[PDB]
């Protein structure tokens with residue numbers, strides 16, 4: 001259940017303008033009235049909510065159970081009449097997908113973003129959690145370039161009695177073949193999705209992005225795994241290859257990937273990502 005659900009959010013927080021649509025409700029900027037820090041508030045009407053309720057519950061449960069610099073920080077969930085307010089860390093730098101809009105990333109930027117995603121995955125997987133929707137749109141940055149995982153509605157939790165999941169969830173272009181087949185799978189599914197995300201960060205789009213998502217549901221289990229094509233460093237191509245093995249047990253762990261030559265050679269301080277954030281702000285303004 002939601003044992004630490006709170007009430008009266010406006011005693012503590014001020015709701016400001018809408019930011020965008022979240023996975024299951026609108027996201028607003030807000031203010032923590034005790035610190036004057038900006039927060040994000042995801043609001044969903046439980047009146048209108050129906051099918052999404054299980055995933056709303058899962059998002060809250062996962063947020064509440066994580067305490068990592070690499071996972072969106074959680075303030076709490078508040079009941080306000082028929083609405084639920086989920087109050088979180090404000091991440092104002094844009095998603096990694098947003099930051100791709102003005103043009104290509106360089107390999108330092110790719111390696112830095114991937115390193116931080118990997119730290120997030122290493123944390124989640126150590127907590128027996130599987131994100132299951134890893135993609136650039138669910139990687140959010142702060143204004144100062146910190147990188148955090150977001151969007152936990154379809155996260156899975158392994159336990160002592162259920163050591164694998166089998167639910168068909170995720171976003172088709174990024175889904176591991178064993179998830180599509182609804183085989184028993186685990187955190188190695190996230191490692192496949194990470195490989196697709198690496199291609200996305202390097203090329204701007206995942207493999208098969210031209211095709212109808214339903215078609216990729218047969219293409220992915222049948223086809224050879226994607227490779228990174230183009231003039232990229234050998235370590236980046238090999239990083240992608242390591243992730244995108246059809247056999248999950250042959251994929252490295254997140255911890256192992258943090259030692260990969262591509263990451264060690266190319267990842268730098270996250271603060272340098274502010275360059276990318278400024279590029280996006282300029283681009284959105286010139287638009």
Ligand SMILES: Nc1ncnc2c1c(-c1cnc3[nH]ccc3c1)nn2C1CCCC1
Nearest residue numbers: 019020021027040072089090091150151152
């Ligand atoms: N915390 C945030 N800060 C700033 N902007 C945010 C967010 C979120 C957001 C929304 N839901 C979430 N669930 C778990 C992490 C998480 C993050 N989503 N967004 C959205 C980015 C596109 C629409 C608004």
